[PDB]
Amino acid sequence: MKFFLKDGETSRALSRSESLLRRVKELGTNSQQSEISECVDEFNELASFNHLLVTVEHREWMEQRIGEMLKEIRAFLKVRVVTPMHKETASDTLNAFLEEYCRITGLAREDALREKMRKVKSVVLFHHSELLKFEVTENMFSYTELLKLNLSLRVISSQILGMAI
Amino acid sequence: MKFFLKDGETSRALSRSESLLRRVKELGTNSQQSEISECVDEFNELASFNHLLVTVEHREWMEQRIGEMLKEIRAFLKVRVVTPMHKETASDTLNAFLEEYCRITGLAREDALREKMRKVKSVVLFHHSELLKFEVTENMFSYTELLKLNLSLRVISSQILGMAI
Amino acid sequence: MKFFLKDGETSRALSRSESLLRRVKELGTNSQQSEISECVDEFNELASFNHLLVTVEHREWMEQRIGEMLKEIRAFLKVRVVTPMHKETASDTLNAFLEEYCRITGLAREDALREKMRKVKSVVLFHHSELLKFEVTENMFSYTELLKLNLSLRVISSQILGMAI
Amino acid sequence: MKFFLKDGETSRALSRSESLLRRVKELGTNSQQSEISECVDEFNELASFNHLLVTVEHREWMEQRIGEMLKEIRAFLKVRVVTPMHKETASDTLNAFLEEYCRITGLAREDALREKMRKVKSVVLFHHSELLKFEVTENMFSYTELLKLNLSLRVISSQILGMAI
Amino acid sequence: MKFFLKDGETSRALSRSESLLRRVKELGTNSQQSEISECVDEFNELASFNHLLVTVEHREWMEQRIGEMLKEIRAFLKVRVVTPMHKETASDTLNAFLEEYCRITGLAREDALREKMRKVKSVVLFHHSELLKFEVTENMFSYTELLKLNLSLRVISSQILGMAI
Amino acid sequence: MKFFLKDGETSRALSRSESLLRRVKELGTNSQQSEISECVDEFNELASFNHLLVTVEHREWMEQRIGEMLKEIRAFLKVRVVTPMHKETASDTLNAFLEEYCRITGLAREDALREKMRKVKSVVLFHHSELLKFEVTENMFSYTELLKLNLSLRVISSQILGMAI
Amino acid sequence: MKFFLKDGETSRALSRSESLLRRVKELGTNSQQSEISECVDEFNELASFNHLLVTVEHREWMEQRIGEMLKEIRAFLKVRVVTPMHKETASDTLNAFLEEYCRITGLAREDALREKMRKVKSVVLFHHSELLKFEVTENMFSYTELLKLNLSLRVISSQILGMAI
Amino acid sequence: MKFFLKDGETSRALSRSESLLRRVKELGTNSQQSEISECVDEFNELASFNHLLVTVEHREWMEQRIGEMLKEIRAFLKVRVVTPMHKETASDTLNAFLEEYCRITGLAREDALREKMRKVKSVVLFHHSELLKFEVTENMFSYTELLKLNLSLRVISSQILGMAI
């Protein structure tokens, strides 16, 4: 149950993340997905290590700042991670989520259209998070509030934003 | 405090409402507001009388069906009462309600825009209800669920249905 | 269920009742039943309207004085309304109520005589109230305390006021 | 404090009261006051003796039926004792009690008239009881219920039985 | 239940007892039992009457001194009432009470001898009280404390005052 | 606080008391006070030792019959120990106690006569017990019950057994 | 039950113990067990007597310092009383207690070894106390705390002081 | 806050730990500290990873065996990890812990000697645990029970195992 971290390590990871931050600030709309995606990899490891570090420290206290930087790296990187449900309209955003949920769950549309946005979004988001190795939350889209609504997609689409089907 | 109803009266009002119902079933998308609106007047009176009749009976019990019909007339007439916030888009529906609330409350837009849809709607609706002498509820609009959202109009407009201002 | 009152209306009724009051203060022991009785009619309508008004206001509050005059008009008019149990003696007052109760309830005398004055009175009173469209209470008679006694008419008539049968 | 009764005594009194009972059953509406009144005398003595007897026995128990007959004799004799408030009408019965209370208490009429019948009666009754050496209760009158009313004589006289003053 | 006393009576009995007191002060060791005993009769009657008078007054209060004298007469007369258990020795006093209790209860001696003095005395005393129509208490004897002892007569006799049997 | 007994001891004292018992049975009314009194001495020591033995055993239990013989020796010896208040009458028994209490306490008679027998007896008995090295209880006298009475000697003497002073 | 002490006695015992104290102060590490042991004998007797003296006094109070010296003698003598479990090592101290407990209880070693030191110690100590007629407590050994441990002898010997068996 | 693990990973770590177990079973009392210590390094990393794996899984469940092996590796490796307080005697074990605690805390001996073994032990153990990156518990020493004693080191050393200072 109990584990300790190799000593050349907190600092190895502190300056390893320091220069991730440096590197992430460099990104803009045309660094390749090839770049960005390994930029995530790095972030992800450091995120892990931090969780170790935290619990170690917490455990060590009982025997009686990196994350601050990660917090920032996230904020920069958040902006360059794009899913296929990143759309130009409220309306296509919804379809994206619909079709994507159908894709993931393997459900017919008729059934997915009955599902509340809330499931559909968190089903779809967890999926892509897993897949990008980056947590992708609702406030990473401009239609955040839309994606939080507790109503079936059909109702949202017809009663909230006058769509067909 | 106590009052009695004139006796040639319940039936006078039963068959008076019977032929209202008859008449209301006749309405369609082109009877004039001039027609419809007196069709409401009548309904309104019968609604009043019924409240008397009810309270009289209730009082009489303690000394020890028309409404069913009204319920129907309502359902029919509900469909022919149009407000100026009856719109073809989700988007204009929202503007209508905004502009109308500004009009009623005399608030600037900037402030109205900060208000939750919910207030804005029931403020506006009560207003027009009073004005048409007919109760006008959210489910008298195709954008019912929209009108129920507990979010500022600004948020709805930008995050729920990508509008400008 | 919900109804609204026509707007030229509260005031139409306020000054309608104001001059009822004027008119009722003119009555005295020799205005005809013909006069008085229409005087009640008017009072009755205004009493109804008030009940609408009250409930409208109460309802309107939730979306967030006439009766005072009625109260007076009642007080004045109370004094000029006569039932057939208005009698010159305590004794005939009791008979009047007995006979009338028998009439209303269809009971034999023998049974009515066993009834407590209290029922008998409020049975009879409610009846005539209904009938005159005016509430007729016990203190509209000079034998009020008598009409309040919780004793069978037999007992009242023999033990309280030495009558035969 | 302690006293004993003379031994030829309980039985002397048992058969003394036995023949009182015999004698009292003979009375009817025309035995003279002269007769009846001695009939009370006898009853009174036997009532006393009984109270001694009772307390002696009770006392004697601690060192470890006549009254039944008296109870009857009372019942018979109760019916033949007359006060000056024994009247033919409810109405004079009330006056009788009024006037008598004024006499006993020395109050003005105006004040007595404000008193509740109940006091007035039990004031008057106790008085005459004392005076006739016989307990005189309300059900010794035909207007018993009347004498029990908890209402001022004024109210009773005007509202209950339409009298003047 | 309720009885009244004849009016020429309290005073008739006040001065009737006043001259009893007078007469009782006259007694000394040689007035005959014939004198003394009627002196008790009188006392006894006055004692009775007083109990009436008391209860009458007490009852009369609720409708809102002789005894003092008796108290004295008692004290004087107490001293002249002799029982057959009035003895010159502690020892014979005990026998007297034994033999007398055997007489009254009809018990054999052997059993009486086992009884506690206390019973034996209050049995015997009540008896003679009843018989003399005067209350005869322990402190009417010089051996009061003896008569109060809660010990069998056998024990008293042998262990308290070295008697035989 | 804690002590142990020398081992050649329980038995040394068991047969030492066995032959005391033998010796005490020999006593009769004419063994000298010189004999008897050393017979007490012995008994007293054995009594002591027993108290040790008892408490030792009791203590020893917690770390987890002689007296029966003493009980008998007492019973025999009790009968040969005589105080100066051993008298032939109830009456002289009392004086004995009186004079003896005066002697011990140094009080005047007038004061001692006021004292309750109970004090006077236990004052006097403790004294002689101390003095004879033998506990002398009330039931060692034929007037036991007398000596237990809770009354002043004066009262006992005059009211219980007709003495002078 | 009650016993008295012979009067030439408290002082006989006070100076008897006074010169015991003198004598005990003389002891050192080479007075023979022969000396010391009779020194205990004496102490023991005086301890006894004291218990008598105490209870006599306590008893005598109810009829309304030697021990201080014994307290001291104990403290001196305590230091010269040796058991066979008085050892040079923690290790042999344990064995001594083990073997001794086996001897006393007649248990096999295997079972004794499982017993908690606490029992074993207070079993063994009470035994030798009884046998030396001196209370022998844990703080009469240099390994007090060891003797107090609530652990089986096996555990103590192996885990607390690296012994074999 | 949320992180994901790289997918070629759980199995990379499962067989990585599988062959650690193989290797650890090889150790015996003569594999160098150089060997053993890197054996711990490995174990430590796998312990870390596991904590990640666990939390990921636990987190993933909410969106709705390696450790078993580590448990074993620990048990084997536990036996080959030695501290400087691993001694041949109870006695030196104590010193070792004392001196070590002085070293860690920088306290004088005099004060350390007053500290309860319990603190001293868990202070010293946490230290070396941290320093070996292996949890080192009391039952990794043959004097477990000793190390658990709630007594100052001075008392333990003098009263429990007859040491000097």
Curated annotation (Swiss-Prot), chains A, B, C, D, E, F, G, H:
Keyword annotations: Host cytoplasm, Host-virus interaction, Inhibition of host innate immune response by virus, RNA-binding, Suppressor of RNA silencing, Viral immunoevasion
Keyword Transport: no
GO CC list: host cell cytoplasm
Species per Swiss-Prot/TrEMBL record: Beet yellows virus (isolate Ukraine) (BYV)
Pfam families linked: RSS_P20, Suppressor_P21
Compartment list: Host cytoplasm
Protein name from the UniProt record: RNA silencing suppressor
Assembly mode: Homooctamer. The eight monomers assemble into a closed ring that binds RNA.
InterPro entries: RSS_P20_N (IPR021742), Suppressor_P21_C (IPR021575)
Function: Acts as a suppressor of RNA-mediated gene silencing, also known as post-transcriptional gene silencing (PTGS), a mechanism of plant viral defense that limits the accumulation of viral RNAs. Binds to ssRNAs and dsRNAs in vitro. Also functions as a replication enhancer.
Gene Ontology MF annotations: identical protein binding; RNA binding
An example Gene Ontology biological process: symbiont-mediated suppression of host innate immune response
Record keyword Kinase present: no
